[PDB]
């Protein structure tokens, strides 16, 4: 029975401290489904998550990305998570990706950081060293001569 | 070898401290050309490692990027791409970051738009290194976890 | 001046043809070095101008990015970024885009994620240069247009 | 009055051949509000547009971006368009942005080209020049000697 394989790829692991669902997906386990022939997978996957999250439920998603990357399993899991109906995106408290390779780590942090308004507000674009003196005193910094020419 | 770690310090270093006495780490972008002379090294990985020891896991700090003349490019482009894929704590804990470029608008017009179009969905995500880091956000006692987070 | 136009052709040129005799336009990325010598200029706008003369509107072609080098940069990210902000017809009409680089994944890992997370809404957009170009898609006779698209 | 300064920024300019609305936004016309004070502008705007597109209704949207960049007017009109309830994004058939400055044109084309799956499908990452031979024959190419060291 493959409905069991499909239950070790994605399952309800717990219920956090607010009593809302915490659904786990273990991306590396997308390899069990290679053994089947003439399957869809993403429709099987989509109707299964629909069985684990009904409409109106606020939940948390957690992706265990051990032994997968943006170019293999974690790529498709996340692409597939993005293709979900909007209510799944509206109703998540947070998505967690845990432990992937170095590439994908810095791929993810870049995407998240482009999206972090809290952070992109912190930038301040000045035209020369002179205009910095107002915020950080130039008498407080040892700098090479390159920054002065 | 050691010449490499010294070129790292000419690229990124603590220049001084502000009032409230916190680090002001500068990156003299330009100085990335010092690395063109090298054989095989993942520069960006070694550079992330250097910053990680310049600023420890909780201390508010300031960052400033110098890149005055245009050229091809000022490599300011690549320095902020690197800074954007850095650890999360380095973004939450930074007080302000100053770029000195003049022609900045042409650079960061693309990144301003990608930020505009960033979905509301993708602002919910957070990357974590080990599964222990997921505690504090969700207590792992509430959870059955797959056998791979165990030996 | 003329030296600048020559460094442009050393960077991006027509390389050859395939079948039915469609241009293969090579860009050797390591050749962005030639422009560090210069002062002033918007290199990115000059290169966009140069490609426009190398490939006319509706005409299929193949692109090849040569970046086998290493150190600070292969120049492949900077010239792929430049390629992504080119007019839509250059992307519709390219047959294939061969990027010759060893360590390529570590660069395009970031763009693969941004494409994954790109919304379906964003995919509905299109930039047009002039109000005239909109006629193709929605007929302008059907519409009241604000006086601003006019010059009474 | 002020409700009389919105129809000049957003109107149902007409209908396409398939008999669905087309909504014009003229991003420039957005300083007719610096003269008001108190006015929140963003919520009045959302209310106005909600009165031109009914919930179940497919439409087009065109942005006349004459005299605006990603750093003014056009940037806020798009940040605002992105802030809208999901049905406005599900329901558009297309979004046209017309005639902005060179920066923004390049910024817009870049975002769309990351989005465009048909485009990014066309890349093939070969490891060295030798592998290019199976696709484009090197008999056919004038190349500098650099591509061969």
UniProtKB/Swiss-Prot annotation, chains A, D:
One GO term (biological process): small GTPase-mediated signal transduction
One of the record's GO cellular component terms: cell division site
Subcellular location: Golgi apparatus
Keywords: Golgi apparatus, GTPase activation
GO function term, MF aspect, one: phospholipid transfer activity
Species this protein is from: Schizosaccharomyces pombe (strain 972 / ATCC 24843)
Keyword check for Methyltransferase: no
Major subcellular location class: Golgi
Stated name of the protein: Putative Rho GTPase-activating protein C1565.02c
Ribonucleoprotein found in the keyword field: no
